[PDB]
């Protein structure tokens, strides 16, 4: 009822053998969006052209690791386990409070509206465009004490061509009121359980072996290969002779191998040092999107980012590329920056053990056929798809990164591991929608068929609990020497990091991946 709480606060984590359960509770605030309306969106902006609808609904997003793990819990996870994956999820929305806002001569006053409801439903059949996996804001804040605003639900429709936002007969419009939903007054609560499909464990380890060094460095191969086609050390000089050799130690680059580095697409490398880059504007015919690796879908350019899993530059190197995820640093509050130091660069350098380098190339190959009179040019293999015998590691997941992505509803897909990182799921955690039910204001006393457009101003607030059961696999290495471990090593600090400062503001100072432990190939 009114004077009885419909749920309690729960924010712990229980570790067991092969399992860990996270529990997170936060307070949310839901305003009335679009003034209770559905607005048709759309704008012709060349490669940025889009169309769709903004809805009056809000939705819950739990798609970031820091929503579920405290920094210390993340450390417990990554320093001791080789793998992890989500198993189950339970969500609760309770302690609903609908507030009525009234304006007067001076300030505005808020009051409880005990009879008003909010509507809530989970799109458990995936009938609505899924947007919880687009690397966007709106997830539960990392800090348990923070109160967040429920994000407004909106979706994009089919864009035809690369110049007009105009919709065709294929474009769909989805009305969310057209779905069944629970109506909740201040005493009611909402709950939903979900199970994850079996997904592979994320690999929480860096490789301690290189793909091109899997042989016994003490033994020769029983395989032979061409060593040279002339005597000497000079090109186009010496005596022509087919010099063959048994492949033996210290000539590892020429050993016959069973496996190849995974697929790759060359990205453009930029320096964190301004004057080290070519001057390329943000807009115009020569905008940056042009000089950045990009895919073309229906004439529209889409920057390749982060792109396929590739080895990148170290997080502290002077260079970076679109293959690297960049987060706002602890002192970054705006939405633009000219100083890279205010941002947090992630890195996939551990991938150099099996994956090709993002700003380099997969390799080289002949530009033609050689002969005693023709030396072919050495062509660059800047892009290469799946070839039999290739192996690769997916990119890493981050503490402040996404957890899952919905695998697109298509006939074909190659290695459905979301490129921003995480778990590709056919049936991901369902989107949960919430909306403040409209309450008509004082009506006219004469009938009118015109739809009511006068409403009492309201907003709701409540709590949301999310519990995730995770399956983990402990590292079982036989390595003798100490491993690398994520450790607090900031030294002397005026204000303890990973903690609210003197003013009470909580910020995340660094990006934490999951690859400290190692594993051989």
Candidates 181, 321, 346, 417: give the one binding a copy of itself (CB under 8 A): 181
Query: Is 520 part of any known ligand binding site?
Result: no
Candidates 18, 19, 46, 177: give the one binding a copy of itself (CB under 8 A): 177
Stretch of 115-123, 203-211, 283-291, 392-400 lying at the interface with a copy of itself (CB under 8 A): 115-123
Residues 60-79 that bind a copy of itself (CB under 8 A): 70
Q: Rule CB under 8 A: is residue 152 a binding residue for a copy of itself?
A: yes
Candidates 451, 476, 480, 482: give the one binding a copy of itself (CB under 8 A): 451
For residue 486 the two structure tokens come to: 């994520």
For residue 311 the two structure tokens come to: 């080895």
Cβ nearer to Mg ion, comparing 409 with 478:
409
| CA-to-CA dists, residue 338 to 143, 274, 288, 322, 451, angstroms | 28, 9, 16, 17, 50
Q: How far is the CB of 215 from a copy of itself (least distance, A)?
A: 42
Query: Is 409 part of any known ligand binding site?
Result: yes
| The entry of a copy of itself, Mg ion, none that residue 200 binds, CB within 5 to 8 Å by partner kind | none
Sequence-distant (≥ 6) Cβ neighbours of residue 188 within 8 angstroms: 6, 96, 182
| The entry of a copy of itself, Mg ion, none that residue 64 binds, CB within 5 to 8 Å by partner kind | Mg ion
Residues 377-416 that bind Mg ion (CB under 5 A): 409
| The entry of a copy of itself, Mg ion, none that residue 285 binds, CB within 5 to 8 Å by partner kind | none
Cβ nearer to a copy of itself, comparing 307 with 329:
329
Q: How far is the CB of 72 from a copy of itself (least distance, A)?
A: 9
Residues 135-154 that bind Mg ion (CB under 5 A): 139
Candidates 225, 499, 520, 521: give the one binding a copy of itself (CB under 8 A): 499
Sequence-distant (≥ 6) Cβ neighbours of residue 417 within 8 angstroms: 309, 394, 423, 424
Q: How far is the CB of 87 from a copy of itself (least distance, A)?
A: 21
- Centre a 10 Å sphere on the Cβ of residue 259 and count the other Cβ atoms it contains: 14
Cβ nearer to a copy of itself, comparing 181 with 293:
181
Stretch of 180-188, 265-273, 299-307, 351-359 lying at the interface with a copy of itself (CB under 8 A): 180-188
Q: Rule CB under 8 A: is residue 322 a binding residue for a copy of itself?
A: no
Cβ nearer to a copy of itself, comparing 37 with 391:
37
Candidates 439, 469, 477, 510: give the one binding a copy of itself (CB under 8 A): 439
For residue 149 the two structure tokens come to: 């605003």
Candidates 126, 130, 143, 327: give the one binding a copy of itself (CB under 8 A): 143
Q: Rule CB under 8 A: is residue 155 a binding residue for a copy of itself?
A: no
Candidates 106, 284, 334, 389: give the one binding a copy of itself (CB under 8 A): 106
> How far apart are alpha carbons 309 and 202 in whole angstroms?
14
In a 3-state reduction of DSSP, which class is residue 153? strand
With tokens 């690297």, the residue in question is 324
Say if CB 182 and CB 120 are below 8 A apart: yes
Sequence-distant (≥ 6) Cβ neighbours of residue 31 within 8 angstroms: 149, 436, 459
For residue 257 the two structure tokens come to: 């191998």
> How far apart are alpha carbons 369 and 171 in whole angstroms?
52
Radius of gyration of the chain from its Cα atoms, rounded to whole angstroms:
28
Query: Is 10 part of any known ligand binding site?
Result: no
Burial of 436 (0-12, 13-18, 19+ CB in 10 A): buried
- Residue 169 DSSP one-character state: T
Say if CB 516 and CB 485 are below 8 A apart: yes
> How far apart are alpha carbons 159 and 42 in whole angstroms?
10
Q: Rule CB under 8 A: is residue 38 a binding residue for a copy of itself?
A: yes
Closest by CA position to 424, among listed 412, 410, 406, 409? 406
| The entry of a copy of itself, Mg ion, none that residue 105 binds, CB within 5 to 8 Å by partner kind | a copy of itself
Q: Rule CB under 8 A: is residue 507 a binding residue for a copy of itself?
A: no
> How far apart are alpha carbons 292 and 380 in whole angstroms?
18
Q: Which residues bind Mg ion (CB under 5 A)?
A: 64, 139, 409
Binding residues for Mg(2+): 66, 207, 409
């Amino acid at each position: 009822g009114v004077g009885n709480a419909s749920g309690d606060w729960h924010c712990d984590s229980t570790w067991s053998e092969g399992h860990v359960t996270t529990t997170s509770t936060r307070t949310w605030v839901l305003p009335t969006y679009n003034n209770h309306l559905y607005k048709r969106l759309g704008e012709s902006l060349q490669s940025n052209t889009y169309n769709g609808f903004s809805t009056p609904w809000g939705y819950f997003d739990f798609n970031r690791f820091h929503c579920h793990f405290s920094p210390r819990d993340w450390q417990r996870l990554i320093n001791n386990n080789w793998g992890m994956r989500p198993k189950a999820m339970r969500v609760k929305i309770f302690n609903i409070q609908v507030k009525e806002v009234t304006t007067s001569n001076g300030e505005t006053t808020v009051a409880n509206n005990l009879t008003s409801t909010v509507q809530i439903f989970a799109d458990s059949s995936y009938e609505l465009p899924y947007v919880m996996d687009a690397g966007q804001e709106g997830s539960l804040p990392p800090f348990p004490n923070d109160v967040f605003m429920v994000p407004q639900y909106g979706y994009c429709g089919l864009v035809t061509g690369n110049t007009s936002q105009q919709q065709t007969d294929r474009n769909a419009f989805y009305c969310l009121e057209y779905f069944p939903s629970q109506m909740l007054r201040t005493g009611n609560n909402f709950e939903i359980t979900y199970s994850f499909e079996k997904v592979p464990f994320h690999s929480m380890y860096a490789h301690s072996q290189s793909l091109d060094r899997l042989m016994n460095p003490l033994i020769d191969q029983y395989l032979w290969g061409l060593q040279s086609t002339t005597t000497g050390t000079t090109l186009n000089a010496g005596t022509a002779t087919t010099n063959f050799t048994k492949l033996r130690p210290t000539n590892f680059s020429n050993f016959k191998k069973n496996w190849l580095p995974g697929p790759s697409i060359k990205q453009q490398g930029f320096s964190k040092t301004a004057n080290q880059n070519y001057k390329i504007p943000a807009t115009g015919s020569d905008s940056l999107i042009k000089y950045e690796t990009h895919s073309t879908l229906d004439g529209r350019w889409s920057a390749l980012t982060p792109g396929p899993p590739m080895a990148t530059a170290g997080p502290a190197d002077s260079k970076f590329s679109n293959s690297q995820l960049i987060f706002a640093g602890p002192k970054q509050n705006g939405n633009t920056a000219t100083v890279p130091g205010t941002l947090i660069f992630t890195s996939e350098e551990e991938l150099a053990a099996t994956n090709a380098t993002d700003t380099d190339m997969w390799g080289n190959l002949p530009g033609g056929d050689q002969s005693n009179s023709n030396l072919p040019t050495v062509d660059r293999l800047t892009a290469l798809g799946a070839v039999p015998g290739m192996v690769w590691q997916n990119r890493d997941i981050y503490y402040q990164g996404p957890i899952w992505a919905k695998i697109p509803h298509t006939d074909g897909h190659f290695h459905p591991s979301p490129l921003i990182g995480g778990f590709g799921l056919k049936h991901p955690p369902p989107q949960i929608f919430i909306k403040n039910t409209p309450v008509p204001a004082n009506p006219a006393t004469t009938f009118s068929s015109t739809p009511v457009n006068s409403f009492i101003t309201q907003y709701s607030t409540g709590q949301v609990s999310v519990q995730i059961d995770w399956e983990i696999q402990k590292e079982r290495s036989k390595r003798w020497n100490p491993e690398v471990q994520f450790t607090s090593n900031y030294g002397q600090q005026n204000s303890l990091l990973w903690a609210p400062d003197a003013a009470g503001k909580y910020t995340e100072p660094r990006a934490i991946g999951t690859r400290y432990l190692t594993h051989h190939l």
